[PDB]
Amino acid sequence: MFLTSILLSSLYLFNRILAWQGNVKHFYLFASNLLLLFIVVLYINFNTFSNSFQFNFELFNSLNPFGLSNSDISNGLLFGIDGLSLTFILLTVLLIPLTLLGNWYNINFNSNLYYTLVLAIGLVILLNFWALDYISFYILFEATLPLLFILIHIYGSSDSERASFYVLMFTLSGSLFMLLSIVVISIVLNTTNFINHNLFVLSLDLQTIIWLGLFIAIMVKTPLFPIHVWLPVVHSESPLAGSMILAGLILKLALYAILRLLLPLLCEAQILYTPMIYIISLLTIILTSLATLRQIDLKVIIAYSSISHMGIAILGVCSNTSLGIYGSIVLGVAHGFVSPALFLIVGGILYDRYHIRIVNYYKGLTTYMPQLATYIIILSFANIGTPLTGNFTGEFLSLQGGFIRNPIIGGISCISVLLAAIYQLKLTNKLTGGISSIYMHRTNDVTIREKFIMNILIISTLIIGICPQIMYNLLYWTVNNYIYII
Amino acid sequence: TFFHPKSREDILNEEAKIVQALNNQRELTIKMHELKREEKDYAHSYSPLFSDPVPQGGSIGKAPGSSRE
Amino acid sequence: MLILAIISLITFVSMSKLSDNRAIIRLINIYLILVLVLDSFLYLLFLNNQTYTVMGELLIFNSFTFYIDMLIYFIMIVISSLYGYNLYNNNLYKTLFEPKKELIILFLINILGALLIVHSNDFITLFVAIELQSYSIYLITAIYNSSYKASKASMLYFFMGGILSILIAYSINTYYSVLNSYTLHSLDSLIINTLDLNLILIALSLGLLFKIGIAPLHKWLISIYENTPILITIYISLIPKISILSYLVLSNISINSLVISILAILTLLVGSVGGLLQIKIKRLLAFSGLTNAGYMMLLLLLNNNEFSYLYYITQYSISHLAIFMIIIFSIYYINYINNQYNPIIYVNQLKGLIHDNAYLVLSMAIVVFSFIGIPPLLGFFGKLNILMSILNNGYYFISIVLIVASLISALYYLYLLNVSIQDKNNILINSNETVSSVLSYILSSLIILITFGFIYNSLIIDIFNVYFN
Amino acid sequence: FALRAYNEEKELALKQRLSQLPPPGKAFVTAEGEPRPAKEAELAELAEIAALYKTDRVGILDILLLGNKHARLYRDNTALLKDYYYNGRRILDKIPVKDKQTGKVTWEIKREGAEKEDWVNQMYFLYAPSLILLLIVMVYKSREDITFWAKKELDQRVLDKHPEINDAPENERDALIVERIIAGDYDKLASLQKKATP
Amino acid sequence: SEHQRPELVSFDDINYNDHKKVREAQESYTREQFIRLEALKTVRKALEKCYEESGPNHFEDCKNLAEQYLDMLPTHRLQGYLGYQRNDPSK
Amino acid sequence: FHPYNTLGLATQSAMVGLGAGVVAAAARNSLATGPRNILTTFSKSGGVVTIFTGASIAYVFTYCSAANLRERKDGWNHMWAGAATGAVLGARTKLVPAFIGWTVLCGAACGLFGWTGARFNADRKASLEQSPKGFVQEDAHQTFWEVVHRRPLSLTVEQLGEGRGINAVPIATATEAPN
Numbered sequence A: 001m002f003l004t005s006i007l008l009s010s011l012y013l014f015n016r017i018l019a020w021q022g023n024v025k026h027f028y029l030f031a032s033n034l035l036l037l038f039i040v041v042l043y044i045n046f047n048t049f050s051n052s053f054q055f056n057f058e059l060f061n062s063l064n065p066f067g068l069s070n071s072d073i074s075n076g077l078l079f080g081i082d083g084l085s086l087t088f089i090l091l092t093v094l095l096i097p098l099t100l101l102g103n104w105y106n107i108n109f110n111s112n113l114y115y116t117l118v119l120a121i122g123l124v125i126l127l128n129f130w131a132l133d134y135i136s137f138y139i140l141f142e143a144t145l146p147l148l149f150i151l152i153h154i155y156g157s158s159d160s161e162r163a164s165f166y167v168l169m170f171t172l173s174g175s176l177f178m179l180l181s182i183v184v185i186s187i188v189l190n191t192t193n194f195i196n197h198n199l200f201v202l203s204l205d206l207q208t209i210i211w212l213g214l215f216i217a218i219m220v221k222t223p224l225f226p227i228h229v230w231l232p233v234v235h236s237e238s239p240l241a242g243s244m245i246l247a248g249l250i251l252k253l254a255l256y257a258i259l260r261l262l263l264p265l266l267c268e269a270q271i272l273y274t275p276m277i278y279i280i281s282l283l284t285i286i287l288t289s290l291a292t293l294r295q296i297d298l299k300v301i302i303a304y305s306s307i308s309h310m311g312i313a314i315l316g317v318c319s320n321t322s323l324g325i326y327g328s329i330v331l332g333v334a335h336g337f338v339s340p341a342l343f344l345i346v347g348g349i350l351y352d353r354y355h356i357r358i359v360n361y362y363k364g365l366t367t368y369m370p371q372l373a374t375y376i377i378i379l380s381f382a383n384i385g386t387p388l389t390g391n392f393t394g395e396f397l398s399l400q401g402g403f404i405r406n407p408i409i410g411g412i413s414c415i416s417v418l419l420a421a422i423y424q425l426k427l428t429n430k431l432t433g434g435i436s437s438i439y440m441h442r443t444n445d446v447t448i449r450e451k452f453i454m455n456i457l458i459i460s461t462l463i464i465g466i467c468p469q470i471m472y473n474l475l476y477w478t479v480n481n482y483i484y485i486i
Numbered sequence B: 001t002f003f004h005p006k007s008r009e010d011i012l013n014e015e016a017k018i019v020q021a022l023n024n025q026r027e028l029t030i031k032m033h034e035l036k037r038e039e040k041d042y043a044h045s046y047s048p049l050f051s052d053p054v055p056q057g058g059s060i061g062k063a064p065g066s067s068r069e
Numbered sequence C: 001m002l003i004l005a006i007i008s009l010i011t012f013v014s015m016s017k018l019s020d021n022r023a024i025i026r027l028i029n030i031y032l033i034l035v036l037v038l039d040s041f042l043y044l045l046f047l048n049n050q051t052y053t054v055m056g057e058l059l060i061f062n063s064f065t066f067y068i069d070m071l072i073y074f075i076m077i078v079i080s081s082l083y084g085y086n087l088y089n090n091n092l093y094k095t096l097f098e099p100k101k102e103l104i105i106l107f108l109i110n111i112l113g114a115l116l117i118v119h120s121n122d123f124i125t126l127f128v129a130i131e132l133q134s135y136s137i138y139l140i141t142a143i144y145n146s147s148y149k150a151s152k153a154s155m156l157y158f159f160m161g162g163i164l165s166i167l168i169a170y171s172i173n174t175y176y177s178v179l180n181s182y183t184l185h186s187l188d189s190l191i192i193n194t195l196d197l198n199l200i201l202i203a204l205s206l207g208l209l210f211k212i213g214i215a216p217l218h219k220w221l222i223s224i225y226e227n228t229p230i231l232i233t234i235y236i237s238l239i240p241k242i243s244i245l246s247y248l249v250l251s252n253i254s255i256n257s258l259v260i261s262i263l264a265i266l267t268l269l270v271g272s273v274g275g276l277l278q279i280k281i282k283r284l285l286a287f288s289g290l291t292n293a294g295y296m297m298l299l300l301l302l303n304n305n306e307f308s309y310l311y312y313i314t315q316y317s318i319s320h321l322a323i324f325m326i327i328i329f330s331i332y333y334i335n336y337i338n339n340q341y342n343p344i345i346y347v348n349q350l351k352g353l354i355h356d357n358a359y360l361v362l363s364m365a366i367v368v369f370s371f372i373g374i375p376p377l378l379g380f381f382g383k384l385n386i387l388m389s390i391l392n393n394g395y396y397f398i399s400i401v402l403i404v405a406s407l408i409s410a411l412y413y414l415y416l417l418n419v420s421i422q423d424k425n426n427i428l429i430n431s432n433e434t435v436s437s438v439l440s441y442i443l444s445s446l447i448i449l450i451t452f453g454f455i456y457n458s459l460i461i462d463i464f465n466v467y468f469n
Numbered sequence D: 001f002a003l004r005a006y007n008e009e010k011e012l013a014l015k016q017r018l019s020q021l022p023p024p025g026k027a028f029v030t031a032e033g034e035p036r037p038a039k040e041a042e043l044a045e046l047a048e049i050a051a052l053y054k055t056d057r058v059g060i061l062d063i064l065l066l067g068n069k070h071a072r073l074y075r076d077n078t079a080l081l082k083d084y085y086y087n088g089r090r091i092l093d094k095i096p097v098k099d100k101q102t103g104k105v106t107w108e109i110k111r112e113g114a115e116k117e118d119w120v121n122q123m124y125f126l127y128a129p130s131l132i133l134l135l136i137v138m139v140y141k142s143r144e145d146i147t148f149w150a151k152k153e154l155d156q157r158v159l160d161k162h163p164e165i166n167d168a169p170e171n172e173r174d175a176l177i178v179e180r181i182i183a184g185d186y187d188k189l190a191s192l193q194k195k196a197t198p
Numbered sequence E: 001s002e003h004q005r006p007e008l009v010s011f012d013d014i015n016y017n018d019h020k021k022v023r024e025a026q027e028s029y030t031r032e033q034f035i036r037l038e039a040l041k042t043v044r045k046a047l048e049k050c051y052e053e054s055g056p057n058h059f060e061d062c063k064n065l066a067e068q069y070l071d072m073l074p075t076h077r078l079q080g081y082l083g084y085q086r087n088d089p090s091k
Numbered sequence F: 001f002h003p004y005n006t007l008g009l010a011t012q013s014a015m016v017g018l019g020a021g022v023v024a025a026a027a028r029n030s031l032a033t034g035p036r037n038i039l040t041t042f043s044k045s046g047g048v049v050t051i052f053t054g055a056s057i058a059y060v061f062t063y064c065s066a067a068n069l070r071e072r073k074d075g076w077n078h079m080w081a082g083a084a085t086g087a088v089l090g091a092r093t094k095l096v097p098a099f100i101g102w103t104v105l106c107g108a109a110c111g112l113f114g115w116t117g118a119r120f121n122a123d124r125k126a127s128l129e130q131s132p133k134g135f136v137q138e139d140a141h142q143t144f145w146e147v148v149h150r151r152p153l154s155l156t157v158e159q160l161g162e163g164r165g166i167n168a169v170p171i172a173t174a175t176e177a178p179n
């Protein structure tokens, strides 16, 4: 048989489906679930007793540009997965179909472009977790900004133009300093690959310079104080699929980028610089939480909430402790579950019914919308870090690592546990509490679709909170591969 | 029983072959950066046929005593 | 082939009517295609970077110059296609885009001057070719003599190019006064470090560079590009730049100059900032060309700059042609024809193009994000190779300026896309007139090159390592 | 669901059969926003074209084989059926149910079944079981963590250094392995630090 | 069960261009540190048992085990391979 | 280092700035629109002479002073010189926050310019191309652009400092039972 025959079969089927039924969302959801199943099969066929990279493949080689390489000279883009990659890949393939189904009935103009852009962003993020050099990583790290610009501009809310320009310009600003870093690495080492880059020990005075660019990128993408102001606007004014994808995966690309680009290389610069990281992270935690306490827009509140938990994750990943790394990864996963559920509630349930996000209009949803109130309470108490959810496990271990590394900063950072509760429950109490608003008419409660999405995202976080250990078979190497202790 | 992962030895060997290809490309890039910016011949850089840089000037009033080495 | 073409077209156009000039352009376009197909095997002469001196020692032929010549033929093919094929068979498009009788001859003579600039090895050839380029491109700016703006631009361009040619001649004759020579091969290590020679050489470099708009001498050429016809602007904004920058890259004249560094920083800042308040399309694209000229000025300070320059000039040529072609295609949907010569002037006339032609806006987006340097597109790899070279050679402040200019220019690049993907009332529902097949294919091919050329980068590097190293 | 259930003539009649009806947005309202304003013959008519939305009018081997001019007809007169169906479903709060023997369908109230969404068969039978499979795989790959391997290895090293434990009774070897572990150092990490020994 | 027992490689005896041996050495270092941890956990389990059996006599009966646990805890832990891979202690 | 002569360099600074201001005033007089003469070069110039002279004096004075106070030659001196020059350029706008912003931002900019080497040019004997690169061969001291497979531990301990994981002897060998 042929490769081209099989993908031409798929292409012809897609063309005929589009001809007869003029929509692509069913085919993209079929491909969504098919990709999820294929990745589960790869996990079935994944050896946990090897730290090596598996399922390797190379593209755009000199000898076979439109195929895979078997060469003894490798000049193309390298791909392959470690357990760390596979964790976030599982998250990505879990979330993509939910982002498609979250906007199933609320896109009534140029639907096919919306679904194409969503699936394309998701596949770019998947391939970005599959990358094994600085350049493929970069070209998949920056390739989402055109798609996000177009998606947010065409399908966004009132202030969508500003958000579109922000999500491109801020990220490009950080990523070009990342590019200077990568260029320096490539001209100095004459190699870019994530397999043997811990074998090349650069001088400290040059590590300290490369680290600056990589960390500026990580600061703009994570985000971290003082460069966190784009995230409220973008996550607020985007379509629901965009906000879900962003908060769930694109923010975690920065965590993966730390672990994959900055710790294995640049170990001595990192071990000299990390108190500055702790300064920035503690600021990012406390000031962003307090800033959340005086916001009037719901999706904006959830957007600000993402930043503090990513700061706790940064404390964990920059801790030089195995428990801290594991905690940061569990935080990434559990936040990728919980935050898109909150974004669904505040951007696809309520926004689809009332088309407004100002808190002053919302009060007393419990009376006519009780199931939604139950979901709000569950997801709020999960977001603030209640035990038996992965959020608590990750927070606990990240703060353990931060305390081990710097007891004073890591101990002061434990007011996260309080401030999270304040800014989340001050909103939950008003939404669920009181007499139902006079500015709002009655509308339907949550549907079977919305409930399906929220229930998947709640089951996942409860599984990884009740037994976090199930994620260790893909991470017991990663929790020791990036630790610099003599 | 459904778990049929590639063994550790074969994984290590495939990764090693990949890293060997990558180091080969590295050494090729260094060699090419060194073969460039290396001084070439007058025949390779300017003129392969008339390979004498020495100029023989005019011919209409050629004075004996004008050539010099 | 060019001189054969010139001597043939002069006769054939003299003995032909004005109804035949379009078909003449088609004929010579196919001629250039056949040349680029059948005669391009001459690349094998330059294996292992073998260099040849021709016409005494007046011309130089290497892989660099062969590549630039193939590129100039490709550009002339596209620009001739825009004149030889009607977009729409309407009276409007037979009023806006008509070739004048002598235009093709002047284009070919300007191409001749371009190539004799890049192939020059002695300053007499350089000067003769600079003048053959500049006189012809004066007349190209002036051939549409029923335009007030074009005549005005013709005369400004004549005088400013004349003054800068005076500067080039002064530089050349001073070099001769010092060394008694017109050849840069006369220079070596010893002569450079024994004679102070940088004033003459940078005077030559600046006389050549201010002829392509290097700041602070940019406003005049931007006015000329604004005030000329669109199908003349597309030529006069690209080919002189390729010619002169290729000469200055092949001739290693400004290897660590402070003046060229300063003026390149100034070009970047001006070309990024001044384009932010521009409301017109051609001035915006002119400032884009200015900042790209700055990026290419930076690699006049390297001494190993062939790959970066060739990649960047090829991708900039493709992007320039594509964006001008998209603006030419958008005239069918703009609601107000401004002139017989510049039918579209302002960027807000592109408002709502996605509702009339969406894939034209996809093309625009691809080109805009290549200009911004977004991966996996081609401008990203261009910027990457430039950064690689300048950081390998120790230009660390210029790199940060380059990043900042890349960021500031994105705003006026995105102005176009933003207004294009906006909503519009009175959309198009049906039209029985169809745009040309050939020009559509040319634009689609350029867009596909921008989008999928990164697949072949490994192969291109492997060929470069044999023909240029 | 059927294989080859396309029939050109009914579509090419149904086109202007629907064009003779008013627009879907304005049909069930009458511009007065009342179901009563629409006439009752018109109402039964709308009901029996709307019930034709959820009928198999095409199969797999008819979408893979037939040409574009027929597929476009199907598409642009199926959109109308969809919109009539759902606009009636929202404005009137009734679905059409043709009962068994009488050949006349009209809008009815009964909404405790006989309606399914188009995303259910995809998710509930491709996505949910794949996540259950992922849970199963995670749980049974947790058996391959390094903790268990290290326990088995350490016990084996103790048994290799002290083979006398094996002939002892079978429910006493664990305490003896524990004793020898507590006593000794069976790790081999300083074994690997050769250049650290001065 | 087919319990695996891979061969122990050191960073001091290998050439870092042979990547197979480098990966073997990384995995060796990590595996032996996990065995150290299992020793620590055996000590902790014995301490817990002696505490739960003795009660007020634990101060005397579990003394050596408690001191051993607190001597082992700072040192028998995961500390990563990069610190030894990238540093020669002989210089 | 070798000390700078502050007052001499600053006097040269002031004369250069004065000449440049005269040249800019003449250029403005000739490029301008309205009716103008040889009177207007200093009447209608927008403080160009004072801009140039103040910036020049401030920059050179502050640079040489900070170099003599700090007893060093580095980019922080350019940071201070940019702070002073920005303070001069911002005192023109008779507003406090603009003055502060001018000072801070041109300080940061000129300090970056000094951090990168205080040059728009290149050094060209410290660049990667002209410097020894790649893997270092036999126990030799790693230079800036060179690469190493395995680094010295005494060097690590000095560059980084003891504590927080990094110790003069590995933990396992240091706690190995002497048996």
Ligand SMILES: CCCCCCCCCCCCCCCCCC(=O)OC[C@H](COP(=O)(O)OCCN)OC(=O)CCCCCCCCCCCCCCCCC
Residues within 6 Å of the ligand: C163, C164, C166, C167, C168, C170, C198, C199, C200, C202, C203, C206, C256, C257, C258, C259, C260
């Ligand atoms: C074209 C129109 C026709 C009119 C033409 C007019 C005559 C032409 C005049 C000369 C040609 C114009 C040159 C254009 C200016 C740019 C020249 C240039 O950039 O070369 C500078 C060059 C050093 O620069 P560079 O090589 O890049 O850096 C490495 C440094 N080692 O090389 C040098 O180092 C230059 C050497 C420095 C000396 C410069 C001489 C100026 C002296 C003026 C003193 C006047 C007295 C004081 C003030 C009087 C006012 C009252």
Ligand SMILES: CCCCCCCCCCCCCCCCCC(=O)OC[C@H](COP(=O)(O)OCCN)OC(=O)CCCCCCCCCCCCCCCCC
Residues within 6 Å of the ligand: C216, C262, C263, C265, C266, C401, F015, F016, F019, F020, F021, F022, F023, F024, F025, F027, F028, F031, F032
């Ligand atoms: C007499 C006694 C002499 C004594 C000997 C010592 C004298 C030293 C003299 C130094 C030279 C001084 C020249 C002053 C500049 C020329 C005057 C001028 O005004 O330039 C700008 C000019 C007209 O501007 P204007 O009409 O006034 O209107 C402005 C409204 N925007 O319009 C123009 O476009 C002309 C521009 C000329 C620019 C020359 C190149 C400058 C290079 C810029 C450096 C950038 C580098 C910094 C990089 C930092 C990056 C962040």
Ligand SMILES: CCCCCCCCCCCC(=O)OC[C@H](COP(=O)(O)OCC[N+](C)(C)C)OC(=O)CCCCCCCCCCC
Residues within 6 Å of the ligand: C040, C041, C043, C063, C066, C067, C070, C071, C074, C307, C310, C311, C314, C315, C449, C452, C453, C454, C456, C460, C463, C464, C467
């Ligand atoms: C040449 C026509 C140019 C017109 C524009 C079209 C681009 C053609 C690129 C071929 C270059 C080559 O294959 O060559 C590689 C050249 C030197 O090789 P060469 O001496 O010129 O031999 C070529 C012999 N030909 C003429 C028979 C082919 O290295 C370079 O730096 C090329 C840098 C250009 C990067 C742009 C890539 C665009 C994607 C190409 C997708 C097919």
Ligand SMILES: CCCCCCCCCCCCO[C@H]1O[C@H](CO)[C@@H](O[C@H]2O[C@@H](CO)[C@H](O)[C@H](O)[C@@H]2O)[C@H](O)[C@H]1O
Residues within 6 Å of the ligand: A055, A056, A057, A068, A123, A126, A127, A130, B014
């Ligand atoms: C754009 C959509 C996003 C998709 C992202 C998901 C991509 C998933 C790809 C994973 C599959 C990779 O699996 C990969 O396995 C081996 C590596 O040992 C590759 O390499 C294999 O090549 C073949 C050559 O005939 C031989 O079997 C060879 O011995 C080798 O095993 C395969 O060519 C590739 O299939």
Ligand SMILES: CCCCCCCCCCCCO[C@H]1O[C@H](CO)[C@@H](O[C@H]2O[C@@H](CO)[C@H](O)[C@H](O)[C@@H]2O)[C@H](O)[C@H]1O
Residues within 6 Å of the ligand: A205, A209, A212, C396, C400, F112, F114, F115, F116, F117, F118, F123, F126
């Ligand atoms: C807009 C955001 C801006 C933030 C980004 C900041 C990045 C700026 C690059 C900082 C790194 C520059 O790196 C810097 O390092 C070395 C010291 O290690 C300096 O040290 C060198 O200075 C020069 C100037 O005297 C000489 O060569 C000197 O002998 C020394 O070697 C270099 O002058 C500079 O190259």
Ligand SMILES: CCCCCCCCCCCCO[C@H]1O[C@H](CO)[C@@H](O[C@H]2O[C@@H](CO)[C@H](O)[C@H](O)[C@@H]2O)[C@H](O)[C@H]1O
Residues within 6 Å of the ligand: A177, A180, A181, A184, A205, A209, A210, A212, A213, C396, C399, F125, F126, F127, F142, F143, F144, F145
């Ligand atoms: C945002 C991140 C990217 C920023 C862009 C710039 C990246 C490149 C960083 C600048 C490199 C500067 O590097 C430059 O300074 C170092 C000192 O630190 C010098 O290195 C030299 O320093 C001298 C001391 O003066 C010592 O002998 C040392 O052994 C070495 O030879 C080199 O002259 C040069 O390598």
